[PDB]
């Protein structure tokens, strides 16, 4: 890769600079380069990787939704479909890149609960983003790949992490969104969000003020969804 000649520490430093500059494509390329050095990532480095690609794919998802909406209205020349396909293909390429990094070899080297659950959640997330645009022969298989990754992450997180752990909470949040938006399972989504919220509420008393702030931030997202969904 084009980052093969740059020091790992320099790539991490430049990822942080790119974040400050809101240059998320650069940030993602720097963190991809850091991953490809082959060493495991620290907690801070995993978060940089996630921030970078979440922002890149988030712009593509927003664009895809705009174009898909225009396309569906046009069906109530080929240019709208063509351009939606272009954005869709670029989005799929970003998801494939992230999934490739997780498979080669972040997940298999991740032994601690925090890293392994973080990466398996990411795997669920990027299969979920693929699922949002999928439409034939493979939508079902993409959905089940997302489900499988989320489920393995859930199983580990419930055995190894406290109910207020922000990674565990963000995982449960995203799996509940998977149920509601992708898998046509709104009741599963609501049940998961409710149980997750209530079990976290009962564990808040164990936390410092700073940990309590981290946990309650994600709990509020669970509550916001329950308010939208019920």
């Amino acid at each position: 890769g084009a980052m093969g000649s740059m020091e790992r520490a320099s790539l991490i430093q430049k990822a942080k600079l790119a974040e400050q500059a809101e240059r998320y494509e650069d940030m993602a390329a720097f963190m991809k380069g850091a991953v490809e050095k082959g060493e495991e990532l620290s907690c801070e480095e995993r978060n940089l990787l996630s921030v970078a690609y979440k922002n890149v794919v988030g712009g593509q998802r927003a664009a895809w939704r705009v174009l898909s909406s225009i396309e569906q209205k046009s069906n109530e020349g080929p240019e709208v479909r063509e351009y939606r396909e272009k954005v869709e293909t670029e989005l799929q390429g970003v998801c494939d890149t992230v999934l490739g990094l997780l498979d080669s070899h972040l997940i298999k080297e991740a032994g601690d609960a925090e890293s392994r659950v973080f990466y398996l959640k990411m795997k669920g997330d990027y299969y979920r983003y693929l699922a949002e645009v999928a439409t034939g022969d493979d939508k079902k298989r993409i959905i089940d790949s997302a489900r499988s990754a989320y489920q393995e992450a859930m199983d580990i997180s419930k055995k190894e992490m406290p109910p207020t752990n922000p990674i565990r909470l963000g995982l449960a949040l995203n799996f509940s969104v998977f149920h509601y938006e992708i898998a046509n399972s709104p009741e599963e989504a609501i049940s998961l969000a409710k149980t997750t919220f209530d079990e976290a509420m009962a564990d808040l008393h164990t936390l410092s003020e700073d940990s309590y702030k981290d946990s309650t931030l994600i709990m509020q997202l669970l509550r916001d969804n329950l308010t939208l969904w019920t």
Binding site: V51, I167, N174, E181, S211
Partner: peptide
């Protein structure tokens, strides 16, 4: 629906 922030402690 709201999904998780990227950065998680």
């Amino acid at each position: 629906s709201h999904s998780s922030p990227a950065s998680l402690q």
